Design a binder for these strands. Structure first.
Ligand code: MG
Ligand code: MG
Ligand code: MG
Ligand code: MG
Ligand code: MG
Ligand code: MG
Lengths: 185, 58, 131, 141, 125
RNA sequence: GGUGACCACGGGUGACGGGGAAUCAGGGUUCGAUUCCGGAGAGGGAGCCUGAGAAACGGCUACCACAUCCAAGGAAGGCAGCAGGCGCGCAAAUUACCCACUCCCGACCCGGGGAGGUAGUGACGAAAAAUAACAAUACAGGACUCUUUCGAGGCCCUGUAAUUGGAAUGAGUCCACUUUAAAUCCUUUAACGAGGAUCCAUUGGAGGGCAAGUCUGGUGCCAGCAGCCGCGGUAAUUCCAGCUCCAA
């Protein structure tokens, strides 16, 4: 009777123990030095990490030489290096287990632009992303949680419609120009 | 009944009415998550206080 | 027009529908979504066809502007176009006339003649006075 | 001890379902009689019409009266008493009004120093009770 | 500050977050003395106390603002007696509590200057 | 004769069954009226015609219950369909547009389809994600710190945070386009559109569990708070308020 999907799920999890001194500041260390909006994103990444940890644990307890263990073994690994959280020369799955959370955020577009220096002051980095001045290889994207693959690491540049790549200075540049041109001759 | 429920809401009646005065609007969103992180994490003040507060009044 | 270009892809011809099926894309960097009209002759002049059998729709632009994709439909003659083409596009650029009563009065009228039996005079008369 | 034979599942399931009746939590959920005795009848909230503003005294470690109101439920119109939480909510409500009584919070058990009251009053005539106390919206005068 | 620009410079690697004494709690009266030197020290047995001139500055303050000692304490959120102690002259002065009275009173008793026509500028410059 | 302590038979079910949903060491425990499949019903029963297919109900006949018009002679009923009312209840949307898509039906390119699709209502719920950033101004206050005052930075607090101080922007007005059956929305894109950028983030707490006040003023076993320990009779860390902090 309906042609919709209803296929959706929660991307994050709530910590079991609220109001723990150790967890609160350690999380606050993450958002403060990564310029996140709330702890939901910190929980969102840890939930994704928990999943790839969970799958990798499943693969490991599965016996060697099983066709699915190898096939998914490369599949998980080949995509993680594609993200860039894993080094190309490491093809052993248990190094996913030792893999930590803070480097997934290193793959965020919010922090990538700051390290690339195009957007100083990582808090200033995220806003100009929302301001839609940063342009991926052939497209303009405003997503602070955008995760950049290795193939597109080098193609992060300011957009042409932004007033840092191409022309068209922004509206405050325009207003001070005309109020200047009216007050002088 | 005792009729002693006439004392309902007495301490709200006798509470002197003082008002919320004009204060500066506090930052929200990520910005709120900015200032407290800077206030409580990278800060080296050279005094004592027995691990007092970020509003430190020892 | 100084900086607007058209590219076509997934182009396959079919004399089954006496047309060629193909999808356009337009780069209009600092422009709005280009109206369908000036597309129509633009693919005509580089396809040396009549810019009146030209059917194009489905133009949604990707995020950030610029690239806009959509579907085009080029025919051989208006006659073959008229025979095998949805009428709603012919309503867009008016060739197929389209003005009828809403489906409500159709249903009201339809149930009215269903009440009157047999008599052609009153079956057609169910709309003269009951209009 | 306990039987452990592999052809025994009939004994185990029959016994475990027998002893399953012996805890409060499951017996109350499944017997059904508690559902009949529940004034809400499985509901989380229940509309009612106030009959009498009452004050009920505290327990011994405390010393106060608790301003409750007796109420007739709309469906299955039995009468219950429900403590109304705030300082001045009593002057907000008067006789014979529509109130949205809900449970106190520990599954039909008295809370704290109030004896035998298991319900808390919210949502007097459709304007919320909390709205009055904060003054967010006023009486439909 | 100086390394704060350098901390942003060390984007690639390094950098430590050490927390601090702060991060969450409230205590609401700044004990000004070290109580670390106080435990260490042995020679000194005398406190400077508060000097009567600043007590006068308080007097001209609330008198100009029409506050009796009871009212201006409610502003400062301290007991009315610590006002009288500050006015009378014992008071064992405390930096922020003077600062609180510095803010409430137009004059400035805090700091080296005994009294300022306005505290930190009219409308703060 | 047949069945039955391997639970027959009887009763209850707030039982339609299943695919599945929630919770997640394993094991298990609950929920599956609800879009897929199967069954049942069309106020409750019962009986039929036509038909390949009906015990059909947007088919008929009779009884019961409701109930419409009536010149009182009769006639007509089945929204557990789409909407929409009343009633019930803690609890659930607009008497909108369209056959353009999906497919269905018919003698059939051509008609029809409240199936269906589109819109509206819609903090059920899920995904993303604004409420500001940059740089300098700098200057002060502080036990500041490093020489013991002078100078600087290895610091905290606020405050001109102010002509800063001019760059960047959405949220909304809003050109056209686009979209679409026609619209709407989103995406494009002009013109505007920000310095308390007053274009203002709330909801609960601050004894413990459990992060956060031995602040102040009121109250005085009163009002009240408090899931639970407990707090409250004059000097309340728990009520009522102001300030400040914690949490999401
Ligand atoms: Mg069900
Ligand atoms: Mg079905
Ligand atoms: Mg049937
Ligand atoms: Mg039947
Ligand atoms: Mg805002
Ligand atoms: Mg508090």
């Amino acid at each position: 009777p309906v042609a919709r999907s209803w296929v959706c799920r929660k991307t994050y999890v709530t910590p079991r123990r609220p109001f723990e001194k150790s967890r609160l500041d350690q999380e606050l260390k993450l958002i403060g030095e990564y310029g996140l909006r709330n702890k939901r994103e910190v929980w969102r990444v840890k939930f994704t990490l928990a999943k790839i940890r969970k799958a990798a644990r499943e693969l490991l307890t599965l016996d060697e030489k099983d066709p699915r263990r190898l096939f998914e073994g490369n599949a998980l690994l080949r995509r993680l290096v594609r993200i860039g959280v894993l080094d190309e020369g490491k093809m052993k799955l248990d190094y996913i287990l030792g893999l930590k959370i803070e480097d997934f955020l290193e793959r965020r577009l919010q922090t990538q632009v700051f390290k690339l220096g195009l957007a100083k002051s990582i808090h200033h980095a995220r806003v100009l992303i929302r301001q839609r001045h940063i342009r991926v290889r052939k497209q303009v994207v405003n997503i602070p949680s955008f995760i950049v693959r290795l193939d597109s690491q080098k193609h992060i540049d300011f957009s042409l419609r932004s007033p840092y790549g191409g022309g068209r200075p922004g509206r405050v540049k325009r207003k001070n120009a005309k109020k200047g041109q009216g007050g002088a001759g | 009944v005792h009729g002693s429920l006439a004392r309902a809401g007495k301490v709200r009646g006798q509470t002197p009415k003082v008002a919320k005065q004009e204060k500066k609007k506090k930052k929200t969103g990520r910005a709120k998550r900015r200032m407290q992180y800077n206030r409580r994490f990278v800060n080296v003040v050279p005094t004592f206080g027995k691990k007092k507060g970020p509003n430190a009044n020892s | 027009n100084d900086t607007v270009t058209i590219r076509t892809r997934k182009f396959m011809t079919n004399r089954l529908l006496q047309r060629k099926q193909m999808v356009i894309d337009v780069l209009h960097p600092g422009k709005a979504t280009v109206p369908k009209t000036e597309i129509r002759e633009k693919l005509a002049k580089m396809y040396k066809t009549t810019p009146d059998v030209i059917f194009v729709f489905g133009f949604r632009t990707h995020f950030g502007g610029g690239k806009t994709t959509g579907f085009g439909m080029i025919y051989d003659s208006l006659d073959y176009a008229k025979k095998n083409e949805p009428k709603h596009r012919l309503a867009r650029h008016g060739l197929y006339e389209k003005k009828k009563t809403s489906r409500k009065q159709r249903k009201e009228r339809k149930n009215r003649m269903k009440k009157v039996r047999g008599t052609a005079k009153a079956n057609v008369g169910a709309g003269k006075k009951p209009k | 001890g306990k039987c452990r034979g592999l052809r025994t599942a009939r004994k185990l399931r029959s016994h475990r379902r027998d002893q399953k009746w012996h805890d409060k939590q499951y017996k109350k959920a499944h017997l059904g009689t508690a559902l009949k005795a529940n004034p809400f009848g499985g509901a989380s909230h229940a509309k009612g019409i106030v009959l009498e503003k009452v004050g009920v005294e505290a327990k011994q470690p405390n010393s106060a009266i608790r301003k409750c109101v007796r109420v007739q439920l709309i469906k299955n119109g039995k009468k219950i008493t429900a403590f109304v939480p705030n300082d001045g909510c009593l002057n907000f409500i008067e006789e014979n009004d529509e109130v949205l009584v809900a449970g106190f919070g520990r599954k039909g058990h008295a809370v704290g120093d109030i004896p035998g009251v298991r319900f808390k009053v919210v949502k007097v005539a459709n304007v919320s009770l909390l709205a009055l106390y904060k003054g967010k919206k006023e009486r439909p005068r | 500050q100086a390394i704060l620009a350098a901390r942003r410079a060390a984007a690639g690697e390094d950098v430590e977050t050490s927390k601090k004494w702060a991060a969450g709690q409230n205590k609401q009266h700044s004990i000004t003395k070290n109580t670390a030197k106080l435990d260490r020290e042995t020679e000194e047995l005398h406190h400077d106390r508060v000097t009567l001139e600043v007590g006068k500055v308080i007097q001209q303050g609330r008198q100009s603002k029409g506050l009796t000692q009871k009212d201006l304490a409610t502003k400062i959120n301290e007991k009315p007696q610590v006002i009288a102690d500050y006015e009378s002259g014992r008071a064992i002065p405390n930096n922020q509590v003077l600062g609180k009275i510095e803010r409430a009173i137009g004059l400035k008793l805090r700091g080296k200057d005994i009294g300022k026509p306005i505290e930190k500028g009219p409308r703060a410059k």
